[PDB]
Design a protein around this ligand. Structure first.
Ligand SMILES: CCOc1cccc(C(=O)Nc2ccc(C(=N)N)cc2)c1O
Length: 222
């Protein structure tokens, strides 16, 4: 995450850290004790999910680790365009809830009125390094028309755009699959955007979570 700052220790109980080969790969969102939502392009071998983490460089009393027993990629995910960039991970060990481990409810209304939004993650910062402490930033949803102008022919109905006019606060590599939170609800998942990261003109592109209500519920209940 670029141009942000360290999160408040108690503000992100839904945040998951996804690892492969002992290295951080992606972000994720806890949505049920047994399920974590992430981006479909985060599919890698033997994913290890860490909940209750704030600082990746230290062992924390609140942390809970679990392997993945099932990875469910949306049937219509298109890797080249990032269309339908969503995947459900079933935990081997269900999340033991605490003040620092809680699910985040989903935004089910695609026409939800404008609320305060924020992004978070252990992705690439402004200096180009990967931080040990989770970063946070307030951003705003960008109109579909302005986003279409930024990325001609690339924005689908399964995508949302958000960014920051002032400093270009934006998500980056490592934050993928992490949450775009609007009014204490999951509005989006970090998917793609400007390289190098920065949203002053080209906003961050997020999976439009409201579109996947039926698919998520059908997968969890299957
Ligand atoms: C499975 C690991 O995932 C990745 C691997 C390689 C590259 C990326 C990446 O560049 N992602 C990204 C770019 C821009 C924005 C943005 N500016 N909003 C967000 C994410 C990646 O996620």
């Amino acid at each position: 995450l670029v141009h942000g700052g360290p999160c408040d220790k108690t503000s992100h109980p839904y945040q998951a850290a996804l690892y492969t080969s002992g290295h951080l790969l992606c972000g994720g969102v806890l949505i049920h004790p047994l399920w974590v939502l992430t981006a479909a392009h985060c599919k890698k071998p033997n994913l290890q999910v860490f909940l209750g983490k704030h600082n990746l460089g230290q062992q924390e009393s609140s942390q809970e680790q679990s392997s993945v027993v099932r990875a469910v990629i949306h049937p219509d995910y298109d890797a080249a365009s990032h269309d339908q960039d969503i995947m459900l991970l079933r935990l081997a060990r269900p999340a033991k809830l605490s003040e620092l481990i809680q699910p985040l409810p989903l935004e089910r209304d695609c026409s939800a009125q404008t609320t305060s939004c924020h992004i978070l993650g252990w992705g690439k910062t402004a200096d180009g390094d990967f931080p040990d402490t989770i970063q946070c930033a307030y951003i705003h949803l960008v109109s579909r028309e302005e986003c279409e102008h930024a990325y001609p022919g690339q924005i689908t109905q399964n995508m949302l755009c958000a960014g920051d006019e002032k400093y270009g606060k934006d998500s980056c590599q490592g934050d993928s699959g992490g949450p775009l939170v609007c009014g204490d609800h999951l509005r989006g998942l970090v998917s793609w955007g400007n390289i190098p990261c920065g949203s002053k003109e080209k906003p961050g592109v997020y999976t439009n979570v409201c579109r996947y209500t039926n698919w998520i519920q059908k997968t969890i209940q299957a």
